[PDB]
């Protein structure tokens, strides 16, 4: 639910202390009280049923956008554009080559978002950020 934390089962109505904390590795509607109860002692697995990803306390943050897919898309876009920042000055005014670079950036962002070729795209991202 978009109003209540399913892990600690608390409505926003009676408990206004819940917050919109999510994690970049797995986006879960989880509250600050649940985060401090579980992950303060150490890293653990995702408390929502059907997910068992390991995740850390210091990686939690509040979600900006309402849509989970939009939030993860912009986070992946940040994780790509942190190392991919070529501009028209870097391409020396070649507009068609800059457009093709933007095509490649949106392709790899879409691939990381949908997980279709995640291993090869991660390998390409690592060997391109090593330079």
């Amino acid at each position: 639910n978009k109003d209540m934390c399913p892990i600690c089962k608390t409505d926003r109505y009676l408990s206004p202390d819940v917050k919109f904390l999510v994690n970049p590795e797995c986006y879960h509607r989880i509250c600050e009280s649940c985060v401090d109860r579980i992950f303060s002692l150490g890293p653990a697995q995702c408390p929502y049923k059907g997910c068992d990803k390991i995740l850390r306390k210091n990686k939690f943050k509040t979600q900006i956008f309402d849509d989970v897919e939009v939030e993860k898309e912009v986070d992946i876009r940040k994780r790509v554009f942190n190392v991919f920042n070529k501009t028209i000055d870097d391409f020396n005014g070649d507009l068609v080559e800059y457009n093709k670079y933007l095509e490649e950036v949106e392709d790899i962002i879409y691939k990381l978002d949908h997980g279709i070729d995640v291993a090869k795209t991660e390998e390409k991202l690592r060997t391109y950020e090593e330079l």
């Binding site: 849509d67 068609v96 457009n99």
Partner: protein
């Protein structure tokens, strides 16, 4: 008659002319000779429209350049009136010359007003009438029916019959108003809208609204096809700035963002289905966008893009798509994250007043959306919807809203402002946020018009002050003048009532609208004026909420009970159908002598376009000064932009706008110098605004009527009505107020 100005023979369709009409024609002709912009204030009542039409048609037919005429009015009823006067003028010209010369004069309006299809006729929305007309007439339906004759999609027979005959054979030579054009197209089974569109370029004169030349969502098709060295007339241009601002303004709501999210999801599903079925229909789009073809190249001429171009064509970019939004799924993700950013921006508990540059910087740092992909958003959405070939776009209307907002806020950064308000209305309990992208410079939308056209005649009955407009809109005027109408007897009585019968002060400022003394004084004033006014009486209020409150408490206190004893009460409904029936009922009551009062808003639909001549007028009763709500954020932003751009003060501009609305309300009572009617202004603060009135109204306004009370205003009204219920003297009005041909010849000889 037929007379001469310099070397130009002018055929006036009346045997007699007014001196104001002749001096008007002289000024328009010398403006056409010099080749500049003019500002002209003819007095209302006099034949301003017929003088324009007569002189401009004479100039076009006599001079060898044969310049076309673009007649731009503010209201589709006024396009109808100009068309009717044009038929009268050209019938007189045909009768005088013995033959009907090669002439084309047409009016242009929307599909809702020029649709004769029996199925799409009762739809109350021009948007859905437009969308069904494209759904039947993009040519995609025609090609689908050609490929499969058993296809369920249908075609419009009125549009289909236009393919059989040529463009020059759509209509016979002459002038077609909307009613005559509708009758001809109904009896010939043709589409009047597409007929007018296809022979825009063949018109000697084309008459349309200000939207079809200022609003680039519809003017980009019209400006290309009209001549760019043509004479342009701006009739009733006192409220041209509202049209200019509304052309580039936009409001967004959280409901609009919810439908935008749903439309984006439906779009993403649509690309999913099309990519599953056949991907060539997107691959050829990708190839064309890589090659660099735009919406003009990809779209054919007979179909239209899905999102209308919201910005100026010279402000549109000519380079190719940047490639962030070139793919379908990439553009859907871009649109979805833009809409989510808008949803985050509207969750602010206080008022945000920010520049588009600041908005773009915040959007870039929080979402990684740049300005250049936003500048192509409407074009990309139109191309994507075109090659998705969707039947339903009711989910995509909010996507049109988002693309329009994105393109506007991306390509415009100076003279514009984004206002985010946590409360759309303060009366509501639950907060309703709103996002308004407002145009603060009214000169932006009208600058390409003055850059394109050499000769523009800004014209209104009640344009005052005249020097406000060359500052407020950045254009140079070769001559600006206001005429004083010459009358044998004072045809109109302007009176300013600053207090009631019992000398209690009266005012219409919004916070004391519930004052029982002021409401009782206004009710007693309206009762006495209804008792002493013979046929009709129109009462204009500063705002619709003010009118609702004061009329409701008038009915509570029983004032309407003895208003009903004399006149039938008709109120301007916000619904335009009911307002039109109320106006027709008002005119019928004034005609048959039952007696009628029309309570309307001074800034509403009735105040523009609609005239009240002879029995329909006889009294314009102004409840207060029609001041705009000064605490509104958009008006404060516009006033500040005026202050630090054109040195126009807060109170000066507020008084100018309110007094020009009052003037356009007062000017509707007169048509002809035989017409008469009183103009009463019931407020304390009109008494200082005698100089801000138009010149002819100020000449009619005496110094003894600046601080009138209700009872002596009633006595003056009775004396005025008794005085001009008498027959005027033809010897007194023989050659001072209206001229014959010999009088005009004598005046010309005296001038030379």
């Amino acid at each position: 008659m037929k007379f001469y100005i310099d070397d130009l023979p002018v055929l006036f369709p009346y045997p007699k002319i007014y001196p104001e009409q002749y001096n008007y024609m002289c000024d328009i002709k010398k403006t056409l000779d010099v080749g500049g912009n003019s500002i002209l204030e003819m007095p209302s009542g006099t034949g301003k429209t017929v003088s324009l039409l007569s002189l401009t048609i004479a100039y076009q037919m006599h001079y060898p350049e044969h310049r076309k005429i673009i007649y731009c009015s503010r209201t589709m009823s006024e396009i109808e009136k100009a068309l009717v006067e044009l038929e009268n003028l050209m019938d007189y010209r045909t009768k005088e010359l013995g033959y009907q010369e090669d002439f084309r004069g047409l009016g242009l309006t929307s599909r809702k007003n020029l649709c004769l299809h029996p199925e799409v006729s009762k739809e109350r929305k021009g948007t859905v009438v437009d969308e069904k007309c494209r759904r039947m007439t993009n040519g995609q339906a025609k090609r689908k029916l050609e490929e499969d004759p058993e296809a369920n999609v249908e075609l419009c027979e009125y549009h289909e019959n236009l393919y059989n005959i040529e463009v020059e054979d759509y209509l016979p030579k002459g002038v077609f108003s909307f009613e005559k054009l509708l009758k001809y197209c109904e009896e010939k089974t043709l589409c009047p809208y597409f007929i007018v569109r296809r022979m825009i370029s063949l018109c000697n004169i084309i008459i349309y609204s200000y939207h079809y030349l200022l609003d680039p969502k519809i003017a980009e098709r019209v400006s290309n096809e009209v001549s760019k060295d043509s004479i342009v007339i701006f009739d009733e241009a006192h409220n041209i700035d509202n049209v200019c601002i509304e052309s580039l303004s936009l409001d967004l709501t959280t409901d609009a963002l919810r439908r935008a999210t749903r439309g984006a999801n439906a779009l993403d599903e649509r690309i999913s289905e099309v990519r599953k079925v056949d991907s060539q229909k997107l691959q050829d789009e990708y190839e064309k966008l890589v090659q660099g073809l735009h919406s003009a190249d990809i779209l054919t001429d007979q179909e239209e893009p899905f999102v209308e171009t919201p910005v100026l064509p010279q402000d549109l970019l000519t380079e190719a798509i940047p490639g962030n939004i070139r793919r379908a799924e990439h553009f859907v993700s871009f649109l979805k994250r833009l809409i989510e950013y808008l949803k985050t921006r509207m969750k602010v508990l206080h008022v945000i007043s920010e520049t588009p540059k600041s908005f773009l910087q915040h959007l870039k740092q929080l979402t990684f959306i740049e300005r250049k992909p936003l500048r192509f958003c409407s074009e990309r959405l139109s191309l994507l919807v075109r090659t998705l070939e969707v039947t339903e776009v009711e989910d995509f209307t909010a996507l049109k809203d988002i693309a329009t907002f994105a393109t506007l806020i991306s390509t415009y950064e100076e003279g514009f402002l984004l206002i985010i308000e946590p409360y759309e209305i303060e009366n509501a309990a639950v907060p309703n946020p709103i996002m308004r992208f407002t145009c603060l410079d009214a000169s932006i939308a009208i600058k390409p018009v003055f850059e394109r056209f050499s000769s523009v005649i800004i014209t209104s009955g009640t344009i005052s002050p005249l020097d406000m407009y060359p500052r407020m809109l950045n254009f140079k005027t070769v001559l600006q003048k206001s005429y004083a109408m010459t009358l044998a007897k004072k045809s109109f009585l302007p009176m300013i009532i600053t207090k009631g019968s019992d000398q209690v002060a009266i005012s219409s400022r919004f916070e004391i609208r519930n004052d029982p003394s002021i409401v009782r004084n206004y009710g007693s004033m309206l009762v006495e004026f209804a008792k002493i006014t013979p046929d009709g009486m129109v009462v204009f209020f500063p705002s619709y909420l003010y009118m609702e409150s004061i009329v409701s408490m008038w009915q509570t206190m029983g004032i309407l009970d003895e208003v009903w004893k004399h006149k039938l009460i008709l109120v301007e409904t916000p619904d335009a159908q009911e307002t039109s029936l109320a106006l027709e009922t008002y005119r019928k009551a004034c005609s048959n002598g039952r007696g009628a009062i029309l309570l309307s808003v001074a800034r509403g639909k009735v105040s523009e376009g609609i005239d009240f001549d002879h029995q329909y007028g006889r009294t314009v009763l102004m409840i207060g000064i029609p001041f705009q709500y000064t605490e509104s954020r958009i008006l404060k932003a516009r006033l500040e932009f005026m202050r630090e751009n054109y040195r126009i003060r807060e109170n000066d501009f507020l008084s100018f706008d309110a007094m020009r609305h009052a003037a356009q309300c007062l000017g509707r009572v007169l048509r002809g110098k035989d017409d008469y009617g009183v103009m009463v202004l019931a407020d304390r603060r009109f008494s200082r605004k005698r100089s801000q009135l138009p010149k002819w109204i100020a000449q009619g306004l005496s110094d003894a009527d600046l601080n009138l009370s209700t009872d002596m205003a009633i006595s003056n009204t009775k004396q005025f009505l008794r005085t001009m219920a008498q027959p005027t003297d033809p010897k007194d009005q023989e050659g001072v107020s209206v001229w014959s041909y010999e009088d005009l010849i004598k005046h010309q000889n005296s001038r030379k």
